[PDB]
Amino acid sequence: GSRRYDSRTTIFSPEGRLYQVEYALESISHAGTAIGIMASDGIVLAAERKVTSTLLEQDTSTEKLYKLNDKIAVAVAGLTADAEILINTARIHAQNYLKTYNEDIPVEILVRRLSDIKQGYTQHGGLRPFGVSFIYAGYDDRYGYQLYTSNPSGNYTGWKAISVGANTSAAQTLLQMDYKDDMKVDDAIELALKTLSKTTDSSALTYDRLEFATIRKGANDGEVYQKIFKPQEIKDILVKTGIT
Amino acid sequence: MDIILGIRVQDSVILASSKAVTRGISVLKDSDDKTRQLSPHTLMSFAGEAGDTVQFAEYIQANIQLYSIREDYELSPQAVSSFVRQELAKSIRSRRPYQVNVLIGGYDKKKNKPELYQIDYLGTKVELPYGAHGYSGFYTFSLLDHHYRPDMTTEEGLDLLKLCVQELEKRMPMDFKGVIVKIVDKDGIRQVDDFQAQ
Amino acid sequence: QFNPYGDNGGTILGIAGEDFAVLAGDTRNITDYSINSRYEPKVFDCGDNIVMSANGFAADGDALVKRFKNSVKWYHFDHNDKKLSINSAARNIQHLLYGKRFFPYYVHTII
Amino acid sequence: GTGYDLSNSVFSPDGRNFQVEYAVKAVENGTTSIGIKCNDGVVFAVEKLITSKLLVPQKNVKIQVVDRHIGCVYSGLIPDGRHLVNRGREEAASFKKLYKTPIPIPAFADRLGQYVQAHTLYNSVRPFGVSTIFGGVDKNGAHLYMLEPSGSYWGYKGAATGKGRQSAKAELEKLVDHHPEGLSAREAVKQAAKIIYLAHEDNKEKDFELEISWCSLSETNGLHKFVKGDLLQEAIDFAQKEIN
Amino acid sequence: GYDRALSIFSPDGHIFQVEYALEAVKRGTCAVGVKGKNCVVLGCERRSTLKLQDTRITPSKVSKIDSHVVLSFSGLNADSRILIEKARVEAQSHRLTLEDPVTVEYLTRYVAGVQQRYTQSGGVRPFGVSTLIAGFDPRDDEPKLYQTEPSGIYSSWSAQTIGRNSKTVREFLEKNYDRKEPPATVEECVKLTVRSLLEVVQTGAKNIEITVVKPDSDIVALSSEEINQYVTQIEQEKQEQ
Amino acid sequence: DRGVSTFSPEGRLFQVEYSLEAIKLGSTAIGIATKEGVVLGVEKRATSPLLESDSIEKIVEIDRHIGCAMSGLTADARSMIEHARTAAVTHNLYYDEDINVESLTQSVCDLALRFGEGASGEERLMSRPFGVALLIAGHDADDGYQLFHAEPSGTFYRYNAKAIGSGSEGAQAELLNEWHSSLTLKEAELLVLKILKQVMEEKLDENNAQLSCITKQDGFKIYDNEKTAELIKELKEKEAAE
Amino acid sequence: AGYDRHITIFSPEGRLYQVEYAFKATNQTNINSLAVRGKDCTVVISQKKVPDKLLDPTTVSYIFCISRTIGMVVNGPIPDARNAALRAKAEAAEFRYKYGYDMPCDVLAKRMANLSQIYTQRAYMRPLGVILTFVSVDEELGPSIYKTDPAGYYVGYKATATGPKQQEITTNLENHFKKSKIDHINEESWEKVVEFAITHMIDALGTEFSKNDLEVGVATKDKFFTLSAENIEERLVAIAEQD
Amino acid sequence: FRNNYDGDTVTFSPTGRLFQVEYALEAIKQGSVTVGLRSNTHAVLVALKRNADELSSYQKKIIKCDEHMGLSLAGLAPDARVLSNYLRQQCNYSSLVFNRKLAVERAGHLLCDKAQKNTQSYGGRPYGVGLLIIGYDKSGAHLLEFQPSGNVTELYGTAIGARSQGAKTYLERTLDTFIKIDGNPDELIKAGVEAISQSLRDESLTVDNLSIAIVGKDTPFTIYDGEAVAKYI
Amino acid sequence: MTDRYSFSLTTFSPSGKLGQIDYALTAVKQGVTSLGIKATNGVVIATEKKSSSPLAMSETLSKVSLLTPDIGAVYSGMGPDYRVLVDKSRKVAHTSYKRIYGEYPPTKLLVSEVAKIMQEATQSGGVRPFGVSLLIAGHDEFNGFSLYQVDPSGSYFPWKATAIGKGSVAAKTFLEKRWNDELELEDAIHIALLTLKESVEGEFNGDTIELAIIGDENPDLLGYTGIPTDKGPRFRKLTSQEINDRLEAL
């Protein structure tokens, strides 16, 4: 028979742990670090492109920051390809909600959906889990700004500031040290850059190895705006905060 | 057919629905409530095919209550109506379509404004000051076009209806055995148990 | 167009006595104005002391009797050769008939 | 390493399919049977071990017919043989229904071939524990065939398989030499009954029963028929005579 | 298409996957429930492995299946959502066909069946979850409290607990809860509950959440203060001795 | 691993055998059949003083003339009882009559071997065998009062008396002596209540044990605690009377 | 671990053992074959080794007639050869039906190669232990030789050989072309191209052939056919007088 | 050896055996004994029933497939239920569609083919039960022996189960004797009860311990239990 | 019968690695070198035609394939896998784009599709990852010229220039030296021919090398005229000749 070659990706360990999930998490832990910090007037998503080259095109890229909705975006940590499969189903779910209720999908409803999908690969199907962790940054008129996180297990939680990928422990301690409830978006933009700058496994923290995005509610308007910083804008924000 | 009227005044929505249920040659019941409460601040009245009518309402009610529990939140009247339209628009091209017309009236606690939605069995939705399904409109729309004012009080609204119902009791061939009236406002849904002689 | 039904005439009768019962039926089978047979048994002994007849459209009548007899056979196989009471046979026949509620056995049946 | 012999479709380092080979062992372990192609037909014969006096004689028939003109005999796991004939019967009905003409013996062979070869492609099935000798008369001649568990098959002048497979093969090789122009149907029937008695030496411990069948354009009209009564006894004796 | 039998018997007669399902429950945060004379209360501990969470939106530990029944649990969070969803749906279906909300026993029997089904179906592992379901039958005032586990077994308790250190807190309850006279007050009931959590939470005003369910769809959760107020008085009860 | 429906070199099905092992770990259940009715009793066996003992349902009603007791992994019995109740009701709808006690049992036992990862015989989708045994007791006009023992092997036996569970071999040997073809319903009740007290780890009282019977007159009934408590008292007295 | 040798999944070295072992199976018949291109024809030569005397020599072949124009020779076990032949016949039949023209040799090759690539990636399908050589005189490409293997690889050849002594035949042919400087046998009749084939077959193999030791297939404009014991004998005799 | 090739039926051993099947055949021998013998007018089945306790019933071992056919089992009861039930349908089919009684020789073929399917595909297990089939069709009395391996054989008489070899020798010796017990059923039944006790050892065939079935020229396959077999004990 | 392999053949290991993907990458490592360079007015992709016998006709086997008239691809690793991938790619280009929007898909999107197909062979039941890495080069009105690399894991990234296969490391280094954001197509075709010289051991001519570019529209390769907006394909495979002429000024 075939039973011989079956890994049995969905079984419990004698300790009651999910082998594949724990191993997927171990995988995520070697991926570029991504930070998510929520201010009083916005949210900041920052990510470190793990490994690069001189020829790698930084302009025609967006390997870790993806726009889900017009009010929701995510930072990725893990298999880009796996992430794209989940992201796409997520973009579809948002639109079905919009077509059904003629209202944008509340941030948590979208995060729960995706997590449930992940949870499935955990309880049946005999397929390997998705080696991906997301940091969700979004807004809606019920909870305003929200920050979330979901991992291979299918679990998700909310944060004021959080990180995924490598050196999360060090980064979470630094964040838990200088974060403050009243923080303003630009303060957060700075905390994020500092945190990555102290956990990086690289020499310097140049602009070509970074991705930045902010969901601010531009005072001059009355609605929410998503802005994925361009190579240049990241270069600037890097000089100002004093890292040249 | 049945009478299904709805009028949106200053701070509430009023739904009037006939009480008669006629099966062939006889009037089986004279106290039928052609309505369902989709949520604490949203009410839906309906008229149409014999079985499809209640089956559809209860199906819609069930889904809205499930959403409320899952999310611990009450969908806006606009959201509920868009959901209901989609349901009707789906069944119109199915094997056996629900032949049901509805009026959805709710009070949007977030905008603090009453709203009235009219949707026919085809999934045709329109938002109105006052609406009606079937033949009801033919007798009443001229009265409403005339006397309707956006700032009417719930009281002025109940008087405008009373007038509408009287024109209906005069010129319409069928005895619809009066109506049941309900008000939807910032405080929920209540029934004017005295319109039989208000 | 094709019509799946036909009428083979014939008539049947059933009278119940105090400690007996009879089921009669002519033995003529017809089609329109012709006679197909002057002797074609229409009343059958199905076992367990039950006689039944399905009159009307022969093809349907035979299929029913055949299905019922088989019902008796399996009743024995499944409930340890228990006897099928006339009241139980009736209820069984109802399900046999209603089973084709939307493509009826064109027969009036008596047991 | 090892273990290349546990799944039915695995290639061992040398390019073999051990399970198919283990299957053959079941064949050789069976009763012997043969096929003799004559000048206008074919003859089939098989050994029937008599376990005891309780076996009703002439009742547990082993040779089978496919359609009206095909004879099939096999050595090894009997149930598998039947399964293979049931298939061949359907295979043949299908052919006649579409083409009208009854299935050519070569065409029929490939059908059985393809089917048998198929059971060596997936590890979810087992190979056939039988070798089959079959054939008949058709639009252009008589044909004799032998099919192996590997799905391999060829046309034969004479063929045999089972325990007495070597004895038989020997006798057959003689006939092939001492009859270059061709044996006759009536002749092959006797010659066959003989080869079976001889080859019964590799099992001389148990008493047996003989079975012959033939398909001759002249003797049977091209239709497969069982040799019974007189013609049978005449061949039994011809054997008992040269068995001393 | 995947139907490998993951939950099967072993020589000694155990279903190791169900067994390990339980081990995951032991690891889950502690949860407890005690029934009063006119109410039921559910307590759950909030971990502190990581703190900097946004409690506003982060999924809560006590869920409403309907307006008169709640459900708390211990074990894998992802898994609990699946059971909670099916239960909430089943609750609406029941209202729709029987024209009456589910009794707490029925809702419990349903969640238990879903759990049991996953113990003997191919290609699926059991739920690494154990639950506490409480509430009041419709038009009834007698409190109900049931518990379910991976095996699919369920039963009602006067008070019960599940999760890490449930051994300890169960002990507290076995010698602190008298069936003769159950917490006749909504107040003294919420107290007996907080008291038991403290046996294992080790200082945690933010590490303890309580929910009180009363007859006729009267559910409500306490805020840190209301709870920290019980904590304060319970610590003094000790010092004053 | 190995097929969930493989044969041991002895000619036994592993899964079914290991299934029986799990039943030896279940609470004891006893059945006694007399010409006055059949009695079913079971060891509640709560696992904590906080567990409300009446929510332990190890004795259920199939139809009005059939009831049954379980032992082993009880959650695995839900679907079995459902199938049973449905089979009884169904049979009645089709034949306007009561389903024979044996037939109901044979039906339940048909689920028994419907397991595997794809066994060529139908669409037997059930990953493992049932981990619970049943004592089915009822009355029908053709064979009168009956007691049956249905196992996860698909086989079922008819007994005059039978015990399954942790103390089965012990209590069975007890029943072997005590049982005679002319016992009375009252006797059987005491007799069951007695064997239970011997094998139960706990000290038998009306809260950790439950009795029930099935009679042609009032069908299947489950003795409420008060009625049983007394049968216990009447037993204690009769034992100290020699 | 040790199972990455049983099914078609990668080994730590990025290898697929099952595909390598399937290659082994192609030499199991110990038969050698080669093919060359004429000016307007394609010939395939293959050893015919009928050991058993009880075998009907006429039913022992590894050359198949796929279509009116395509011919295929197989190196490997016979059951896998017949499986491949049937499939290719069906494919060429259907292709004609759906597209209105005969399936080209190179296309049928790609199709069969693709089918083989599938067994290389899917775990329940084992590779076929055979190597297929397709020949014909394509209406657009003239004489053609395309060969596929268990790895799913395929390519067109000026001439080629397959079998245990594959290398001896190949280098022999390689040299003849380095010499003639053209990519084909410059002949008009196929009979001569067939002779060339049988000749170089002998030089490289160092063995003499009778009329029952070979098997010949010839592809020509609008038709592919195989020679009979006697058509061959005639070919043997011709090369005899000159040597 | 064995250890690595008895995981499932789809695997052949290096010697060429199917262990899972042999293990199935094993459950048969571990099963209670039953005997079969026929003449030219009748066919009889005598079987020894087994019980658990002394408070338990004796597991029936004779099953009726049609009016002219039936069988006895040795091994897994459930599998006999499945097989007898499949055979019940085959007989019923033949009657309904062709208005013909199913030839005993053909019933055997169907059983063989159904059993074989379970020995070549992954996931299924071989049937663990042996069957003896008797029946009076259009060519006289008949007796068949069914083996889970899928092997069915026509005999004059035979026995299967534990110590079955006793009866099998008695019968193989008594051949010429009973093969002529035509016209008289009581003789075949007595001869059967004898052959079966040749395989006894523990106890002596009692009333509720014995089971006899018969079919013939003018005898629709009928089953005898208890008092009905008293006149043979 | 039936694919009883409905479970994953690629799973996570304790270390967090995905074995089959690692191994597939190892297969790509042993493959013949291939590369791509992006100029300011074009892109060039090239590889070596490693013949498996002088008897084989190297033209009847292209390693550089056209996906759409503006997108081409090349690889390193297992040829067969590449072949079926190219077919699936050319088709998805139609079914998922041309048949909806009436135009061919933009490079990044088609690459995204290809990448998806490869991702599934990394998680779907009963299969192994593809043993190849591709370099896809194309051009689209709103993004201009671009070059991407798709790996067995399904991941993909854009490049200015890069190489994959046998001597990718050496070649990637040689490219960093000679690349600048001001190269003209011909300059890149040159740099390409040089980088590839180090990889090839034996003959280095227009018959041992395969090279195609994505440049200007070739109205002569359209096949018809009469429609103004249809100017021709930007993809052009260089001829054996066109190669040698540049090999001189090498």
Side-chain angles (χ1 to χ4, degrees), chain C residues 75 78-79 87-88 91 95, chain F residues 91 93-97 103:
Chain C
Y75 187 68
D78 297 311
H79 303 72
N87 67 289
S88 291
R91 173 58 66 74
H95 282 74
Chain F
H91 178 93
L93 180 60
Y94 292 142
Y95 302 104
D96 184 34
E97 75 177 12
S103 286

Side-chain angles (χ1 to χ4, degrees), chain G residues 35-198:
Chain G
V36 291
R37 299 183 300 171
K39 217 173 186 55
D40 63 6
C41 72
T42 303
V43 187
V44 307
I45 298 303
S46 180
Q47 288 179 287
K48 180 170 190 168
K49 301 187 185 184
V50 186
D52 208 312
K53 284 195 300 178
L54 290 181
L55 286 171
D56 172 353
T58 54
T59 70
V60 172
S61 182
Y62 287 72
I63 294 177
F64 302 86
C65 295
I66 296 315
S67 67
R68 166 69 78 279
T69 54
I70 300 180
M72 170 191 88
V73 58
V74 179
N75 269 95
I78 198 60
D80 282 12
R82 287 173 178 155
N83 172 130
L86 178 54
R87 183 49 178 271
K89 284 175 176 170
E91 293 287 324
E94 176 192 294
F95 182 106
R96 175 58 187 69
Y97 175 73
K98 290 167 61 180
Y99 306 105
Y101 66 84
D102 309 290
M103 180 156 65
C105 175
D106 53 317
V107 184
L108 165 56
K110 177 179 178 176
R111 170 61 180 162
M112 296 298 299
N114 276 168
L115 241 28
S116 287
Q117 183 281 164
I118 300 304
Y119 317 146
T120 272
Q121 200 164 192
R122 301 205 64 77
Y124 85 112
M125 284 298 296
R126 80 173 173 64
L128 285 175
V130 296
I131 294 183
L132 317 172
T133 307
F134 297 98
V135 301
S136 72
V137 185
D138 184 71
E139 54 175 339
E140 290 187 51
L141 300 188
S144 304
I145 305 171
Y146 284 84
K147 186 163 61 182
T148 73
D149 50 47
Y153 164 91
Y154 94 106
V155 62
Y157 301 81
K158 300 171 186 168
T160 195
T162 307
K165 306 193 176 185
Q166 168 277 165
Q167 188 63 62
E168 286 86 283
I169 326 289
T170 294
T171 46
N172 178 297
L173 286 162
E174 277 185 49
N175 290 158
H176 167 288
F177 285 119
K178 297 173 184 172
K179 204 163 302 175
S180 64
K181 288 182 172 58
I182 55 178
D183 67 324
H184 65 90
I185 278 54
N186 193 169
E187 207 75 57
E188 291 70 58
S189 62
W190 56 265
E191 292 97 346
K192 276 301 177 65
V193 182
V194 167
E195 291 172 8
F196 171 110
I198 303 183

Side-chain angles (χ1 to χ4, degrees), chain C residues 5 24 46 56-58 61-62 68 71 73 77 91 93-94:
Chain C
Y5 296 107
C46 307
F57 170 51
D62 286 7
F68 175 57
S71 239
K73 183 176 191 174
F77 279 144
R91 173 58 66 74
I93 300 285
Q94 174 179 74

Side-chain angles (χ1 to χ4, degrees), chain I residues 80-154:
Chain I
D81 290 9
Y82 170 71
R83 197 175 63 236
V84 316
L85 259 171
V86 184
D87 291 310
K88 298 181 182 289
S89 294
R90 288 164 168 171
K91 185 172 179 175
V92 66
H94 279 63
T95 71
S96 297
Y97 209 98
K98 203 192 170 195
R99 292 181 183 177
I100 315 298
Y101 308 110
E103 50 198 66
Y104 292 97
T107 315
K108 56 186 176 181
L109 288 191
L110 179 57
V111 168
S112 187
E113 289 303 334
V114 176
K116 182 188 181 181
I117 294 202
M118 295 178 77
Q119 185 287 321
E120 280 150 349
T122 257
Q123 179 178 33
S124 293
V127 301
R128 67 167 172 73
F130 287 85
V132 305
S133 272
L134 328 165
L135 291 185
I136 297 173
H139 165 288
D140 62 75
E141 190 189 4
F142 298 64
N143 285 296
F145 299 90
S146 58
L147 174 67
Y148 290 88
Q149 182 194 305
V150 194
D151 284 2
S153 62

Side-chain angles (χ1 to χ4, degrees), chain F residues 200-215:
Chain F
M200 286 187 55
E201 277 284 303
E202 285 295 5
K203 181 194 162 192
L204 192 166
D205 70 311
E206 77 279 359
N207 271 54
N208 63 337
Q210 175 180 286
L211 280 177
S212 67
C213 69
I214 187 277
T215 55

Side-chain angles (χ1 to χ4, degrees), chain A residues 206-227:
Chain A
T206 52
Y207 76 106
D208 61 304
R209 285 160 37 61
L210 279 177
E211 274 175 354
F212 241 72
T214 56
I215 293 179
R216 187 195 297 276
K217 189 172 184 178
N220 208 180
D221 206 68
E223 194 222 349
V224 171
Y225 177 38
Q226 296 192 334
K227 186 182 183 304

Side-chain angles (χ1 to χ4, degrees), chain B residues 1 3 22 24 27 139 168-169 171-177:
Chain B
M1 190 197 263
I3 307 298
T22 301
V27 183
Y139 305 105
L168 278 173
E169 287 175 358
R171 299 294 178 178
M172 216 189 91
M174 298 251 85
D175 193 319
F176 53 85
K177 306 301 178 180

